[PDB]
Each structure stands twice: as structure tokens, then as C-alpha cells.
Amino acid sequence: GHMQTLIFLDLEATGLPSSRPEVTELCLLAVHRRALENTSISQGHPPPVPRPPRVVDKLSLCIAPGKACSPGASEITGLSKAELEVQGRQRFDDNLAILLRAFLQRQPQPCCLVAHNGDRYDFPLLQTELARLSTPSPLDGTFCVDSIAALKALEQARKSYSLGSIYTRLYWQAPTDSATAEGDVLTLLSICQWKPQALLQWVDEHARPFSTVKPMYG
Amino acid sequence: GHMQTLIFLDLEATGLPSSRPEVTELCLLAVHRRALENTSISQGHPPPVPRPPRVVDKLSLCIAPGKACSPGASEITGLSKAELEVQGRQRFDDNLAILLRAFLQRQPQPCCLVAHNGDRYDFPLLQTELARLSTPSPLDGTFCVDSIAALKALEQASKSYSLGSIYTRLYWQAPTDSATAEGDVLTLLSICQWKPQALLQWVDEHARPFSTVKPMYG
DNA sequence: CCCT
DNA sequence: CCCT
């Protein structure tokens, strides 16, 4: 009934939902409630990009997909199944689920996941990948929330609500290292640090369990 | 008999070995053999700072120590037991050992740890922290190597061997984000990317099992 | 002599 | 219309 740790999440995959994609890279960035509360309210025209908090748990992993990547997805991310296999990256396996659960348990509960276009992409895909695994879902007790829905509410308080479009609106800069699991998570964090205590309170009242998120396929 | 994944490691602690320290933060950065082999040989006067490889697994975690930090250690790292406790960071517990083991198992074996002044600080301390845990050591099958010994051999080939002193010698820049588990690991990676295929071959011939590393105390 |  |  109150979120103690916001886990900023983003995945890079082989393609769009219509292509039945598989995760090629993921990145989680755990940050405590009071880490965000202790952050500068973005003032000035333009305001500076807020510094990430000091105490922050992070996990960036590369994953070998079972199928090839599309030319458009390969170019922007700069990844391919051939390259991931040659560097010995393992599949989305049961070992990965253990690694997530161990990482999650360190974070003070209740934790809420945060992903841009998460309710329509990052969560259903992650749920579908966890559906393949014989082990139970490690994100069972955790909550989730789409940052697009959050920023729409905050900013109305008349168009593109993309990750890159929001970041450039707020701070008037190009995102650093686009098309990388970590780079997009860091960009998402910066957006959420715009009005953090306002964002936190919205997440509390609109956060839902990850188990309620229906999968992409299967 | 041949290292497939170099895991760049560094810890931030409550103090020097003489003070019997405890880990306040750690960061692992796994990179495949071929990732380093596919890297620019640093040419030009001065040479540019090499780009980190694309496919790279990373894990940065904050840990609550059982004892207070020294004023000198607190200032440089910008951390304290009071702040770590208030943000709900757990102790160096059995859960952490599982998280390391799960992370390690993803990396193609045999993997070798790399830490600056590791044989005298980062490895013995990590061994002492793992000695407290009731579970077995997750770094059992892994190897290790001190980057100081590596760079001494490479640089004498064709005085101060600190992490900051080496980085400034090679590229003529100040390290980005000093006194942070991740920032020091990224600095170490850059140093090792100076002559990577030469560094790799030295690590092979001087890499030893982590279990041979005697602990700092206990 | 180097890590914190 | 947004994620890759």
C-alpha cells in the first residue's frame, strides 16, 4: 500500500509485438523512494538534467534470442543474434529468473517496475518470456506502471509522448546513448526526476501487480 | 586453460585493510574475450579513450556495512552507514552470494576476475566477506588477477601505478566519476583496453583461482 | 607502496 | 500511435 523502491526497467528485443519478439538485452535500475524525494525540482529555462541518485542498484544483461533480429531492430540497437551467440550470451533461461529474483529481493518491498510503453510492450513481453520458463515468475510480488500514463497526468497538470520526445521537451537535449537497455533506462530515470515527489504519489495510486499484466503471446 | 570472460571487479568499503573494513558497494562488469580482441589499438598522441564494448553484462549493488565508515573513506566515496541503512540496503548476506553465482554462471567459463590492487585489497576482502556467509563461495570455479601486475608487465614492454595515475598517463584525462564502484570499474576497463590482445595473453599465463587468494582477516 |  |  506504498511503494518503497521504484525499479526502472527497459528491454531491447528482436522486433515489434507483431513479429513475436524475444529479448536481446534488459536493464533494471532500482532506486529507493526517498532517493527520488531527495532530488532537485527542475527549475530554470531550460532546467539542467538531474543527477542520478548516489545509492542505486543496477543490473544490465545481454541475452541470446532464439530467432534472428529484423534489419530495423538490428540497426538502432546495434545488436544481432550472430554477435550475441559468438560472445557466449546464454538464452532467456531459468538461471536468469533466479538472477532477477535475487536482485529483486534486495530491494525493499513493495517494489514497482517502471517501463516506457510498458503496459503495451515491456511488461507483456517480459511476461511471455517468463511464461516459457519452467520456474515460477520472480516478479510475482512486484508491482508495475507505465511511465507514459504517469507523464501524461503530470504534464497535463498536444501530442508525441515518446521517450525521446519527452526528454527533449523537458531539458532540450538529445538522449545520451539511445538504443541500449541501460541508456534508455537512464533516460527514463531523468524524465521521472522532473517532478519526483509528484511522480511518486501518482505511482502509488496507479501501481498494479505485475501478475495482472497479460502476456504478449503464448 | 584459456579465459573466455574477463569480469572487471571493484569494491568500495568502510576503510583500509588495517581498519578491518566491510563492503559498502560492489560492481562487476563481465566482458567476453572476443569483445576485447575486437577493440581499437590506442594510437595517436594522445590516444582517445576506447569505447566500452557493446555486448557487456554489468551489476552494480549497494550494501549496508555492519560498522561505521571512516571520515576519509566516507568523503571520497560519498557514502555512509546511516544513508545506506535509511534507503533499506541489506547486509552482505547469503542472498548476495546467490546473486553473484547466478550472474557468474551466465558468463562463459572459465571467467577471470580483474581488480586494481586486487591481490592486496579487493580479493582478500571479498574472500573475508564470503567467509562470513554460511553458503559456499560462488567464486569457486572462477579465476582472478591483479591489473597492477598486468600493466607493470605491459608498460615495461614495448613509479606510481595507481588506477588514476595510469589512466592519466595513457589518455591524459581525469577519470570520470571517481570513488564509485562502477566508475572505477569503467576506468579499469579503459586501462585494459589500451593493449587488449596483449593484456588478454598475459592474463591467461598469470591467472589463478580465486580460492587460492587468502582472506584479509578471520 | 596501493585500495578506502 | 509507441516499443524494437
Distance in Å, residue B19 CA to nucleotide D4 C1': 50
B200-203 long-range contacts, CB within 8 A, separation 24+ = B200/B3, B200/B6, B200/B33, B200/B36, B200/B37, B202/B150, B202/B153, B202/B154, B203/B3, B203/B6, B203/B112, B203/B114, B203/B145, B203/B150
Helix A181-192 / helix A147-156 crossing angle, nearest 10 deg:
30
Could you tell me the CATH number of the domain that includes residue B207?
A: 3.30.420.10
Cα–Cα distance between B59 and B10 in angstroms, integer? 11
Distance in Å, residue A70 CA to nucleotide D4 C1': 9
Range of the domain at B33: 3-213
Cα–Cα distance between B129 and A208 in angstroms, integer? 37
Cα–Cα distance between B201 and A64 in angstroms, integer? 27
Radius of gyration for the alpha carbons in chain B, expressed in angstroms and rounded: 17
The verdict on whether omega for the bond into residue B46 sits within 30 degrees of 0, i.e. cis, is yes
Which nt has its C1' nearest the CA of B15? C4
Cα–Cα distance between B91 and B74 in angstroms, integer? 18
Q: Is residue B218 part of a domain?
A: no
Nearest partner of A213 among A116, A125, A94, judged by Cα = A125
Nearest partner of A22 among A79, A100, A95, judged by Cα = A79
Strand C footprint, Cβ within 7 Å: B 10-13, 15-17, 24, 70, 72-73, 76-77, 116-117, 120-122, 148, 159-165, 179, 184
B79 chain-A contacts, CB cut-off 8 A: 54-55
Q: What is the DSSP letter of B167?
A: H
Q: Which helix (H) or strand (E) holds B182?
A: helix B181-192
C-alpha cell at position B2: 584459456
Residue with cell string 577471470: B112
Q: Is residue A48 part of a domain?
A: yes
Angle at A152 between CA A149 and CA A157, to 5 degrees: 130
Q: How many domains does the structure of chain A reveal? A: 1
C-alpha cell at position B109: 567459463
Angle at B202 between CA B7 and CA B180, to 5 degrees: 35
Q: Could you give phi then psi for residue A78, rounded to 5 degrees?
A: 70, 35
How many Cβ atoms from other residues are within 10 Å of residue A215's Cβ? Answer: 14
Q: Is residue B120 part of a domain?
A: yes
Residue pair B34/B12 in contact (Cβ under 8 Å)? The answer is no
Helices (H) then strands (E): counts for chain B: 9, 6
Nearest partner of B164 among B151, B175, B172, judged by Cα = B175
Nearest partner of A53 among A66, A72, A34, judged by Cα = A34
Binning chain A into helix, strand and coil, the percentages to the nearest 5 are 45, 15, 40
- In three-state secondary structure terms, B54 is coil
Q: Is residue B86 part of a domain?
A: yes
Q: What is the DSSP letter of A48?
A: P
Cα–Cα distance between B56 and A87 in angstroms, integer? 9
Q: What is the DSSP letter of A92?
A: S
- Find the Cα–Cα–Cα–Cα dihedral B100, B103, B105, B110, rounded to 10°: -80
Q: Is residue A101 part of a domain?
A: yes
The verdict on whether omega for the bond into residue A48 sits within 30 degrees of 0, i.e. cis, is no
Task: Judge residue B166's burial from the number of C-beta atoms within 10 Å of its C-beta, 0-12 exposed, 13-18 middle, 19 or more buried.
Answer: buried
Cα–Cα distance between B62 and B79 in angstroms, integer? 10
Q: Is residue B182 part of a domain?
A: yes
Largest CA distance in chain B: 52
Q: Is residue A93 part of a domain?
A: yes
Q: Chain B: residue nearest A85 by CA?
A: B55
Yes or no, beta carbons of A86 and B34 under 8 Å apart: yes
Distance in Å, residue A202 CA to nucleotide D3 C1': 23
| Determination technique used | X-ray
Q: Is the dihedral of CA A52, A53, A54, A58 positive or negative?
A: negative
Q: Is residue A218 part of a domain?
A: no
CB-based contacts of A101, cutoff 8 Å, min separation 6: A138
